[PDB]
A and B are shown apart, each in its own frame.
Chain A
Amino acid sequence: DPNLWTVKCKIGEERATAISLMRKFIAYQFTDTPLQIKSVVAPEHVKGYIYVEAYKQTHVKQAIEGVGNLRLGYWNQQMVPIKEMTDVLKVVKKSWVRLKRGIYKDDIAQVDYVEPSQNTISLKMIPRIDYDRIKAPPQRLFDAEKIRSLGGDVASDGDFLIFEGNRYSRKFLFKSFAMSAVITEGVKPTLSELEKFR
């Protein structure tokens, strides 16, 4: 079994480093200087370094040449315990959700309609907006009359409103958000949010 080593790298850019190493090895396999790495591991949450499986640290250093992502770990590498091999390879794992990005991060969103297209789903959410008064905030009930009075980008359909950010609201935002842009498992609300929505 070839030894395993840790190579330091920039955090967050571990996915494409393996692809670039593949390209290097495939392009160099016909040349007189082939890459001698036996495998490369970049787990889901391991960040800042990548595991390399090769017979010697000399092979690692010779093969990882030309890759800028690992320049921090080019000169120094640490030894991966052999008893930790399996430790490398294990991974552990009308609803309510919470959005992941934007200004609406980490707030309750009630799944109103589930679209069978499996790209976006309908969510009712409390607008965190300033009603086009401050921007050239606390979760508060949407005000249709105030957003009609302040003007700007507004399309009115009685209880329906299309406003800044192409936001669709009724009576309360009702808009489509991606399934991967929300967390569909692990909300478990309390009674206060139910009133809002042993």
Chain B
Amino acid sequence: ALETVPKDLRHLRACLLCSLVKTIDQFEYDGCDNCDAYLQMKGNREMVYDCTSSSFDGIIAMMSPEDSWVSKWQRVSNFKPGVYAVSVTGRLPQGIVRELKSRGVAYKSRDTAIKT
């Protein structure tokens, strides 16, 4: 799936549910490959700003989703291949989290960074 690949290294955002590194331009024009069935990112810039934040560290090139341990460690064995930020600092809005909870989605934070 080449569509997950960002077109440049300028102003990247990552999900707080997928931590999927991707341009804001692709988050608006293309949208997330795994949040589109639940939050409908395609078609709103402000929703992209709220959902995804630029404060991410490190990149992992998840190549084979069913054949890698790092995906199991990052809880992304069941997510699509692509570029994944190691840890994203932030929290999704209470409304988004509640809507995910009602729809059967558990909000598990990707903020694995060591806080001093």
- Please say whether the chains A and B touch (CB closer than 8 A): yes
Residue numbers of A with Cβ under 8 A of B are 1-2, 15-16, 18-19, 21-23, 25-26, 35, 37-44, 53, 85-86, 88-93
CB distance from A40 to the nearest CB of B (A): 4
Asked if A89 and B113 sit within 8 Å, CB to CB, the answer is: no
Least Cβ–Cβ distance between B80 and chain A, in angstroms: 12
- A-facing mask of B61-86, CB < 8 A → 1, else 0? 11110011111011000000011001
Residues of B within 8 A of A (CB): 1-2, 5-6, 9, 57-64, 67-71, 73-74, 82-83, 86-87, 89, 112-116
Q: Are B58 and A22 in contact (CB under 8 A)?
A: no
Query: In the bound complex, what is the Cα–Cα distance between A85 and B74 (angstroms)?
Result: 12
Query: In the bound complex, do residue A92 and residue B70 qualify as a contact, i.e. CB atoms below 8 Å apart?
Result: no
**A35 and B58: CB pair below 8 A?**
no
Q: Which of A2, A35, A39 neighbours the largest number of chain B CB atoms within 10 Å of its CB?
A: A39
CA distance in complex: A23, B69 (Å): 22
Whole-angstrom distance between the Cβ of A178 and the nearest chain B Cβ? 12
| B residues near A42, Cβ cutoff 8 Å | 58-61
Q: A91-B58, A93-B116 are in contact. Are A19 and B63 (CB under 8 A)?
A: no
A22 B5 Cβ-Cβ under 8 A: yes
Q: Which residues from chain A contact B116 at a C-beta distance below 8 Å?
A: 92-93
Query: Nearest A residue to B62 by beta-carbon distance?
Result: A39
Residues of chain B contacted by A37 (CB below 8 angstroms): 63-64
B5 & A90 in contact (Cβ 8 Å cutoff): no
Q: Which interface residue of B60, B83, B115 has the most chain A CB atoms within 10 A?
A: B60
Residues of chain A within 8 A (CB-CB) of B68 are: 2, 38-39, 53
